[model samples]
Every structure is written in C-alpha cells, then in structure tokens.
Target: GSELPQMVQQLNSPDQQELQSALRKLQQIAMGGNEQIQAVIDAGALPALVQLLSSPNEQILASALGALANIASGGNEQIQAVIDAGALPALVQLLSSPNEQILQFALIALANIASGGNEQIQAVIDAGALPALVQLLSSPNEQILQEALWALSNIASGGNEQIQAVIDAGALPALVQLLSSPNEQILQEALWALSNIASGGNEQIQAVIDAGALPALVQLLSSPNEQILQEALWALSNIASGGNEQKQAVKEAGALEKLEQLQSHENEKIQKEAQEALEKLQSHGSGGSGKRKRKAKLSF
Candidate 1:
C-alpha cells in the first residue's frame, strides 16, 4: 500500500542523497514507484539529470543513473526520453564504475531501454555500450552477469547488426563458461540471452556456429534437464538461421538431427523457436566456396 509514498520518500530523502545532493535524489526519483513520479518527470528534470550524466563527477553520473532508472520504468515514451537526452555514452562509461550499485543501475537502465525497439538498440550501440556489455557477460557475480546478459540480450534482439557487435565482443565463449555455474536459473537466463542475440545473422551466428556448444547442448537435451535441451534448441535455431553452411555445422556438431527428431515439444515458445529453426535450415545458402566459383566465372 505504501509503495508509492515510501518510494517517493526514498527519492526525496537525504539518505539516498549523493555528495552533490543530486545522485541519491535522482536514483530515488528515477526509480521511485507511482504516478507522483510523472510530476518530476514532467517538470523538466530529465535534461538537468542528463547534464549530470555528462558531468565529470562520478556522483553526478551516478545520480543520472537514478533518473535513468525512473525513465526506464516509464517504457518506450520515457525510454526515448533518456536516449534523446544522450544517456548511452555516459552510461557506457559507468561499466567500469567501482560502485556496484551505480554500475548495476546504469546497466539496468540500458538493459531496460534496450528492450524498447530497434532505434533504442542503436542508441546503446552508438554510445559504445557494446564493448562494455561484452566484458560484463564475463562477470563472476551471477547477479551482475545476469543483468548484463539481459541487457546484452535486448541489444542482441535488436537485429543482425547489433547481434554482430555482441559476437565481435566475444560473448559465445562466455556462455559456455556460464553453463558450468552452480545456479541453473542464471544459466538458463544466459542461454536465453545467447539465443536472442543469435537471431538470423550469419556473422553473429558464426561466432557460435561450431564452437562445440551443440554437442554439450545436445547431451543436456534429455538428461531430466529439458530446460537445457530447450535452451540448446534455442541456440541451434539461431545458429541454424546462419544458413546451410552454419546449419550443416550445427548438424555436424550433432545437435541438429537429434533436435529435429525430439518428438515435438508441448511448450509453445520452445516449439515456435524450434519450428523457426527448422525453417531457417530448410536450405541456407552456400558458405565461402561460392565466392570462389563466382570469381572464377567472372574471370572466364
């Protein structure tokens, strides 16, 4: 019942107050729950907070995160608001922040905003959040890694180009490493993240094409661990989207054929993603060899 007022107090109080009296308040206001927040958001506080983001002072940047957190919760309209205010560059720099909370907040904001749409996706990419996010995938802290993966997932979902950035950043191996983690839940989330990033792109798909993720994924396909198998399917489908060469790579890796024969899943999401994979692999184009043939033809 007190979610709004209590949150607002947190926003306005000195407790969360930053050294400059802005960061703490901003976090609260940005993250504060309820309609009262619209008042602050409407009062033209966003631009000032954005200025804080561009400020050299870390506290000011951290405060900007608070404001961003609020804007993020507001969805596409507010999401666009932050991106328009130039939040990406400042937020990207915070990936190196020593303050865990601030780092998490900034990432959370980016992740939230990244989920909005393709343009929102491009904003983070242009801001250089790509490389920083790649590094985050390797984070040892499960919570931190999970959030980073989630953000990366959204960006990856943006389309093939953004997906390529993730691949270039070297996140596929990180996914393999995450599988060994004790927390299965985080492990599942990581798989989903990887899957989203792999959507229908050869370059991005190549990163995981034959990285030996399939066999391991296949082995997990039936071990009373359906979730793992499902995740494997998700990854395969994306990799399959790479086309014939990549699809053959997946099939050769040994997960494809077996996955194809899995007697159909009852889960709609899994089934849908699996069917999509089937469609992608129906017949992808030839790999690099075709280019040589085309060159030969031109020479003749």
Candidate 2:
C-alpha cells in the first residue's frame, strides 16, 4: 500500500488544503489496516510527523498525531524512529493542548512509544511526561485515565530506575485510587501498572506496600474476572517473594484464604500462581498446617 507513501507525500505538501487532506488521509489509513501503517513508516512518516508537531494548524497537528500513534505502535524500530526524529519533546509539550483530540493523540503516541525498549522509556521520562500523565489520572474522563495508566504501565516495565521514576512522580497513591473504579478497563490497567511496579525491586515493592496496596489487591482476588484475578495474584506473589517483612505484610493482608480459594480455579495458570504465592509465604515462616498439602494439590 503506497497509501503510506502517499500520506508521506501529503505530509510534505505546501498547500494547506492538500496538507490537511493528507492528514485526513493518514488518519483514515492509520486505522485502515496493517499494510497502510507499514507503508507510513517505510515511507519515512516519522520525520514528516515530527515536522508537523510545530504546525500552527490544529487540525493538521491532530491528524498527524493519529498517524504517528499508528506508526508508534509498529514496534521498537518504528517507535525509536519517531523518537530519533525528535518527536518525544514535541509530544510531551502537546500534553497541554487545549484541544481534547490533540491531548488524546499525543498521549496515545507517547504511550505506544514508551511501551517498549529501555532507552525509549527513559526518553519519555526525561522529556517531562510524568507530571502531566500523573495529573491526568484524576481526570473525570475514562479515556484520558486509560491512556495515562497505560503509559505508566509500560514505563514500569523497565528496570528500577524507570520504576522509581514512576514512584517518584507520586503515581502509587493515584494508582491505588483506581482499583475500585467501576470501569473495567481502567481498573485492570491500574492493576497492570501496579503489578509491573511490584516486579521492579524491594524499594518499589515497599513503595506499593506503603501505599497500602494489599487491601484493594486482596479484594480483587474475589473478582469474577480471570484477568483481574491473575494480575492481582501476580502482584501479591511479587510481594510475597520480596522478603520476610513484605511476605508477612501480604499474609497479614489476609492473602492466604484467597490463595487457598484460588487453588481450585479451573485455570491451571491461576492455580500455579496462587500456589507459588502461598509457597512464598509458607517459606517465610507463615501459612498453617496444610502448607505442604497446598503444594501437593497444585501438582495436579
């Protein structure tokens, strides 16, 4: 699909109408299919999109972001290309856009780019995206909160430094606030972010613990949603594995009965994660009489 190539052509157009037309075209193709998205990237769309970041034309900027978000989703090379072309600073700057679409597209593009690679994640943090992203967590709009949580989730996927960046930005309390959200997507994304954070390190795990994460996480164990249950269990398992103190913290949070309850889940994955969490607690001088028996039950 030279459609991407054509979008690239329009990106370089001097005529305002043609430029806007190309933006519109890119927006359509960005969502059209995979062939169209690949075409945009291979056609060298990032530079063009980066160039448009400074455009005074709001409509052009919005649509250009849509196209960039499409390309950003391409993978490491594609996202790195966008960052290399200097899209990161520009994208972060757009966090203040008065226009809702501009803000949405900007966050979406940044989130996708931050979704992989350590350098890329660091780039987003260094560009000052956190304050705005964290602030948006309180947005009454679900869409904005979803994108913000997603960006944080991807950022937390990195090592200690990156996870610390998120914690330093004061995301833990905000993240814990959403566990009770009625919106399933937002709730799950929040859990996903916290789970990733829990996997980071001792301090990060303690950060989550100090934020009082266990109560909500333990409550999630009873969720009918398997994905929610798995994420909650994973976070708890990480806590259990952290150290003696953290392991005791999890047990004190009443995770044992929940772990015991999950052992009978029809999903083997759930049983495995639950059993592992219980084992961690048991190993740290917790769990009652049937501890060995719990491990035995998981063998099936």
Candidate 3:
C-alpha cells in the first residue's frame, strides 16, 4: 500500500467532494481512535460536516451522518464535543428531508448522544429533535419510523418531563395505534417504546392504557399474523409484569378466553401458540392468585 495519509487526504476535500472509499476508511478510523476522532472534531472537521448537511446528494448527507455518529458514540467526551459543535439542528432538519437514508443515520446520531446524559438530551431539545421525531411516527418508511421511535424513546428517558412532552406530542397514541398496524416490525418497536415509557413510571403506564393500548394489544394476541401475535403477547406479558392494573387488564381482556377459541383454530401453529399464551397469562396474570375479595354491592 502507498504511504499516503488517510486523514490528510479526506480533509483535503474542502468543498465536500464525494469520496466513497475515503469515507469508508474513516468509519474504520472511528472504530479505534476515539480520542483521535475527538481531536479531529476539535481540529475543525465538524463545521465542514455541518456545511455539508445541505448537500443535494442524499448519499453524502447519509455518510456524513454516519461519520458523525462514529464520533458521537466514540465516548461521552466526543458526544459532548459533537453536541457543542452544533450537530442537532442539522440532524433534526434531516428528519424532514426527502432522503430516507439521511433520516435513518440522523436518528442513529441522536440516539447515541441521547444515551449520554441530561446535558446531551438538552442539546437535542434545543435542536428541536423531539418534535421532529414524534412527527416521523407517521413516516411511510418503516425503517425510519423504527429508528425514530427508539431515538425518541432515548430522549424521553431523560426525565418524566421529557416523557410528558413526548406523550403530549402524541407518541403514546401513535404507539398504541401501532398495535392495529399490519406491520409486525413497527408493532414491536411501538411496544418497545411503550415498555420504556412504562418503566419511566405510573403516569406513563396510565398514559399508555388510557390511549387505548390495552384493548388494541389484546386484539393483537389474536392477530392472524403469527409474528404480530407473538410480539403482542410478549408485550402484554411484560406489561402485566408491570403491576396489578396491567394484570387485571390482561384478565379482563380475557386473553385466556381468546386462547380457548384459538385452541380449536384450523391452524395448528396458531392453536399451539394460543395455548402457550394462555398458559403464560393464566399462570402469571392472577389466575386465582390473591384472595377472591368479592366486594359485591346491592346487585347480587
């Protein structure tokens, strides 16, 4: 191999010249020299990337985001560096760009920084990333939506205030409504966000259930799509594991009753799955566990 310098050559492209192999090599550089990457950002590579954000070529924008992500997750220090370099606004803008690929990578960058801490999350908020991500919940590109959902989930984890902000922006209903979607992948992601929200605490759970999630999820357990059925059942099982309200909802949703019907389904696969699901629910979701405190009223 020639003794040519990789960084010197890559940095020589001042006007954002397209160099595929050169950029790919940088991804390799990022894999190890996390400190070197920070030095590069400090050396002023970021402003160039920021300028390149307006590139007419979506591919370049996508690659730029990828490179930025390499640094963003390189370390907590590098993450703060990128944030200080003003990356979030550009990334947020990419969300509405026609390029689906750029949107995807932007989400990757956002997720990496969000995983850093409250300061990083505040940087995202200052950049308007949260609203933009919530808006993408309805994006036609399934992959973009998937990343967008998880990215928002990361920021929402910053605090209950952020969670409330996300919920107010309609993330809860969007996630719950996803249970009715025919796409299993989206349903899984939506359920994941819901689970994260639940872990945030009671208000998030009630927000999920109040958004009509419980009924929609119960319906998914009986979905004709086996994968969807599995995720929905798994999500319900986990939610039930959350607490008494969820447990009661699982019972009242009559997941066991649904399973009894599936026990006789024409598809053996469905029958077996339904049986297993019922076993899981009944065994776990209060199948005669506590004392039957039948506090009856005047109506016998």
Candidate 4:
C-alpha cells in the first residue's frame, strides 16, 4: 500500500517502461477490491490513466483502460472521478480501434461509467459513444457484440433523452436482430436494452414495435430458459403498459396465448409476470382519451 504514491507518480513518467509498470501495478491493485481501487484513485492516478488512453502503444493503452475500468467498478464517486479527468473523449475514440482488445477495453470502461447514473450516462452520450456502440452491434465477434450491447443498454437505462439518443442512433433494428440470436446472453442483453427503450413514451414504444421485434419476442416467451422468458415478458409488459395501440400490437403478435400458457409456468416469478402482463393487456382501453402516465422501470 505504501508503494501506491510512488506508483501513481510513475504513471506520469516520460519513460514508457516506467509508465507501463505503474499502470499494471495500479491496475492489479484496483482489481484487489473497492478499497484498493479507492486507494489508487486517492493516490492521484486517474489523470495519468486518462491521459494514457491516447497512448500509441497498445499495451500501455490497454493497461490504462483496465485500471480505469477497475476504478469505475468501485462506486459513483470513483466513476465520476474518471469522467471528470476527461476520460470520455479518449475512451470514445478507442471504441473505433482496429485492435479488438482496445475496443473491448474501451467498451468495458464506458459501460461501467454509464452505469453510475444519468449524468454519467449523458457524459458518455455527449462524448459521442452511441453511433460507434450501435455499429459494434454487428461485430462478428460475440464478445464485442456483448460489450457493446452492455454499454448501450446502460445508456438506455438513463432518462428519456438518453433512451432517445440510442433510438436516434438507429439501434433498434440491430437490437431487434439480436433478439433472434442463438446465444442466450446476447438475447438477454438485447431484451434488456429494448425493455429500457419500451419503458419510454408512446413513440419510443412504437419504435420497438415498428422494428419488427414482436414476433421474436413472442416466440421467446416459450424459451426453455426461464431468464430469457422473463426478459421477453418484461419487454412485453413495458410495451403493454403503453397506449392502447401498443397493447393491441402485443396482443396481435399472439402474445396472449403465450401469456396464458405461462400462467401455468413452474417458476412463480414467470407466472406472476405473465399474469400481470395479461392483466395489463386486458385493461388496455380503460383510460380512453387520457394521456396514459408512463411508468419508468429500468431493468439493469
């Protein structure tokens, strides 16, 4: 622990080897736990780490990113510290890196910071992370797609404007496309993102509906994986909670039959969600002519 201050000092060394060694040491300490991460941050390592994000050397860039990502995982204050040190622009730039490792590290860091809260999330959006993140949705590598989905999903969990940014970036079609992925993890992350988007206003709900997501979502209701089934149900419930037309879309997608079947599901949580979704679907037109209040429930 006494070595922390010296390590922090070395992070700013003009010598590449000294800088690399310090970054790796701090990164390992950050990985030790929250207290260790806090120690590294308090030792004043963030500015140097943020600065190294622009390093031309691949190894140094990655080590700095790893250290920052670890610090980000600590708490809101730690994440905000990284953002305050101006990590966003450099991290956003790295999202387009030709090296997959750098891209992955950048995505991991952004995703963690975005998870801090709305302001942190908006910082990432303002730093121009959306388009690159959306583009990464089509990455041939599953890991890249997973990280990108995670970052976008966290951003979508923010306010209506944040969710709108994701939609405006043309993320729906790609997100909808991922719903049909054979990989369950991808399916779940896609559902998580769509669920957040659907939790927005009418137009946002309609964005998901218009993207041709209903068929796949309804099909996923019967997935043997209960988690996927739960995620699909969550997305549908958000959509059903929207205006009458949105509820109608869910019903017309043939979700009612699946909901009916799920009421008898072995998992009580699944059954409860299905029953509640069924109730919401059945109560569609009760509030006629009044603007239905949108309830924001983000499933992170």
Candidate 5:
C-alpha cells in the first residue's frame, strides 16, 4: 500500500498482532532511505521499536531490531537517537542469542551504532559489548565472525582506552587465530582490526607482535587485493615502528625485502607505505653495527 506514515501510527495499536504487523511493514518500508527513516523517527517509532526488544515473539523482536539498524544507517543523528532510546544494552544482550538471524542483526545494529562517532562508540563499549564480541569470535558461522570482527574493528578505531578495552577483553588471541582463515573477507577484516590494534600506543602494538602476528602479517604481503596489501603494509609499518626490537621482528619476518619490492610497483599509498617501512627498517640497520653484525647472517 506504500502507506508507511499510517503504518507508523499503528505502532500504538492495542492489538499485539496488529502492532507486530505494523513493525514488519515499517521495517521493510524503512529500508528505502533517509526520508523513510525520518518518517519512522518523527512518528515516535524508536521507543515502540525498542520496547519490542523483549517481545516473546521472535518475529516481532527481529523486525524491531532490524528496523532500528535501518534507522541507524541514516547517520549520526539517527544513530544517536537510537542510543538515546536505550537500544545499546538490549542490543548487547542479544549477542548471545541462539538465533543466528537475531545475532546477525543485533551485531549489524551494534556495529552501525559504533560507527557513529566516539561518544556513540564508547556507548557501545560501556554497554559491555566487548567481551560478548570477543566470545563470538569462536562462532563457526562466518557471518557471525565477520560481523563481530567488523564491530570490533570500529571499536578499535577509537581512543586508546577503547582499543585497550578490546585487547583487555582477550581479543588478541582470537584475532590472531582468525588470521589463519582461508576466507579473504574474514582475512581482510581481521587484518583491518589488527591494524587498528597496532595503531593503539606502544603497549597495544607490542601486544600484537607478542601474539605471533609478524610472520602471518608478512605472508599477507603477497595478497592479490590492494586493500589487504595496504592494510598488511600498514600493520607491518606499526610493527617496525614499535622500537628497535619490534622493528627487528618485522625485519626478521622478511618484511623489509617485500616492502622494498613493493616500493616501485603500483598503488601510490602502498608505494608510500612500503617506502616508509623500508626507511624505518633501513634506519635499524645503520642504528648499530653490533646488532647488524649479529643479524648479519640473515639477509637484509
């Protein structure tokens, strides 16, 4: 009927079944764009949707959560509005749901919320979403793992405190194991998350190196995708920048030669990153004759 405005009004309907129908209709309708989302929000749909989070009916619960995610996709205000409506905590609780569909949508909603901005990102973290996400790393479902990684990646993109929260929640070992996945998308997101972790100050950077990440990261230098290659280079650069010992780790991983090979190849960013890594590595060689003499047997 395309009567979304009227459907939103029905959110106040007394009949449970009638309200359920309204939510499903709104969920599909909101999928259109910002205009549609504003329509939902202006009609005071958020509280109604969030209130449904506790519905015993899975159909109603899924529709409501899914619709909230659609609203969040509209950007900062819409995302903020979702948080102000108290959706954060409920969304976190859903992370452990047995229903894969519910879990996936909940993760999408939380990730979208985290992507809003620092305050919003912090909101998700403060809601205790970190450990829930870290545990989900063990899920055999690739969708769950990929979505969980995406959410953590956004969280890791925050300030040191947030990055530290992710690390302190034991995300390191799980993220390290994920590097072994044959799935390229999973590998890419895993690398992206680790890169953000590396960006975290020296302690965070050391954590990544200590997790046996250097060798696997070096192996990614050969990935055919530019995104993967760029992130891997960025990760290596962080490892190298972690000080002489950590820098020496990258060198030992055979990263210096790869960075050199990538120097003149293609892609301006990759070329720049490669060049920077080589310069960092080069400084190490000249930094000390004794260290160089000790590692001399190994190729530069």
Candidate 6:
C-alpha cells in the first residue's frame, strides 16, 4: 500500500476534494518519519503543495499548510525543499487570515522554517512576517500568542540585524507587558524573548530598559519559579553589562539585595549567575554617586 505516486498525482488534481485528500495523506506520510518525508518530497509533491497555499478554499489551504509544516519538521533539508517551492510569502500572507485555524498552521509552518537557521529566518522576515507576528502578541487566543512569541523569539535569536528588525517592529512594549502574565508558559516565552533581545548591544538593551522593563524585571528576581528568576536575573545582568549608567540603573532598581540573597540560593547555577551579576555591578562601583576610575568599554 505504498502507492505514493498516485497520491502525488492527486495532489496536482484540479478537484478540491482530491487535492485535500492527497494533502492529508501526504501530511500523514510526512509525520511517519524523516525517510517518509524525503519520499514525499522525492515524489515531487512540494510544488503542488506550495501551489495549494493560494487556494481560495480554506480547507485546501489549511491542509497544504499542515502538510508543509510536517515536512518542514523533518529538518533543514526538508524545510529548504518547502521554501524552494516558494512557501514563505503565502505563509506570511496567511498570518492575516481571519480563520484562527489557518493562522495557527501558518504560524507553525513559519516557526518551523525559522528553526532551520539564520538564512531561513531571514527568508521569513524578507517575506514580511514581522509586523503580523508582533501584532499577534496581543491575540486573545493564548495559543496564537504563544506561537507568535515562538516565531518572534526565533527571529530575535539571529544576528543583531535580525534582533533589530523585531525591535523595530515595536515588539518591546508587548514583550515587556507579557512579563507579568499569569500563565507561566506565556511568562516563560516572554522572558525568553526579552532575554534574547537583552542579549543585543547597548541600544537594544536600552530599548528594554526604556520600555519600563526594569521594575518588572527586578520584581521577577524574587519569583518562586527558578527559571523565571534565572531569566530575570540574566536580562538584568546583560543590562548591567552595558555602560556605567546601565549598571547604575540596575543598582538603583534595588537589585543588589536580591542578587546578594540569590548568591546563597540552592540552585548552583542561579547562585553563580547572581554572583556574576553582583560582580558586574561592583566592578563599576555599586555606590550610586561613585565616579568611575576609567570609562567602561562601549558595548556597541
């Protein structure tokens, strides 16, 4: 019952039902394993699947997106095959689909493509995915918010330019806002995204600070969740690593006492992070009015 050729043929059919059935079958086969995914691609199903992305029929479009996303999860080569078949632009357009299911699949596919690496991420960005993704941060649907965060986080993890693109799209305010989310998962993803953004140069770090992120970040230092505490500390430490003024900002935010307390915490890694942050703070003279003996290196 391994008649992949027949399904491939059906994928190119003009009938919507035949195309949907073929896409569902291919999606199932792709999910089976990497070998099967390669077989689907080898059978030349990519172009047909990609072409289906523009179908007027929502069902056909969703099925094609689902199938493409599965093939993309196969790994970088499979992802490239989908991209080579020109899926990025359509995927980006689908971000605006009123149908939540369509939006969800589109985000998943884009996120998977983003995971391939920088060039792949750039491809998605080049196709104009950033603004839509940033807008979705405030989606009423938690799943949509999470997926948008996942995709943007991946984009933020790239080079400085990529991180800047996310920041330029006005992602900072929403990201900072999500820091206090009641859902731990959403909070964690928000923290992850902020951490990556913080990891950028001084301007990026300053953007985080200017977004009123400091008080919330300092507040999170005492979070009962170890990961949350760690992420908050990491973001603060990165800010502290900026300039003398940046270090002073962290010190003035009442972070020193918390950092000191974390030094004796049970988690060894947290203890080390707290110590390092403390040292970074101290190296620049923790006293608010103390003059720096020498200029700190400009991170830019």
Candidate number with greatest lDDT: 4
Identify the runs in model 3 with alpha carbons over 4 angstroms from their true place. Answer: 1-9, 12-22, 31-47, 56-59, 221-234, 241-247, 255-300
Q: List RMSD in Å for every model shown.
A: 10.8, 7.9, 11.1, 5.2, 9.4, 8.5
Worst 10 residues of 4 by lDDT: 291-300
TM-score winner among the candidates? 4
TM value for model 4? 0.89
Please give each candidate's TM-score: 0.72, 0.86, 0.69, 0.89, 0.84, 0.83
Which scores greater on lDDT, model 5 or model 6? Answer: 6
Q: Write the per-residue lDDT of candidate 3 for residues 1-300, one digit (tens) a residue.
A: 131254435644655553544555555555555676755565566665666566776656666677777777666677787877778778887778776666777788787777666677667877777778888888888888888877876766666566666777777777877767777677766766665565445555567777878778777666777666655654554445445675566678666677578778776666665666566555534321110000000100
For candidate 1, the lDDT comes to 0.64
Worst 10 residues of 5 by lDDT: 289-298
How do the residues 1-300 of candidate 4 rate in per-residue lDDT, one tens digit apiece?
A: 689999999987899788888788888888767787788888889888888888898888888888888888777788889999999999998887889988888888888888877788889999999999998999999989988988888888887788899999999999998988999889889998898888778788889999999999998987898899988988888888888889999889999998999999989999998998888889934321111111111111
All candidates in order of lDDT, best leading = 4, 6, 2, 5, 3, 1
Q: Could you give candidate 1's per-residue lDDT for residues 120-152 as a string of tens digits?
A: 777888888877877877777766777787777
Per-model CA lDDT versus the true structure: 0.64, 0.79, 0.65, 0.84, 0.79, 0.81
Name the TM-score of candidate 1.
0.72
Backbone clash pairs in model 3 (N, Cα, C under 3 Å; residues 3+ apart or in different chains), count: 0
Pairs of residues at least 3 apart in sequence or in different chains that clash in candidate 2: none
Q: What is the lDDT of residue 53 in candidate 4?
A: 88
Off by over 4 Å in 1: 1-40, 52-64, 264-300
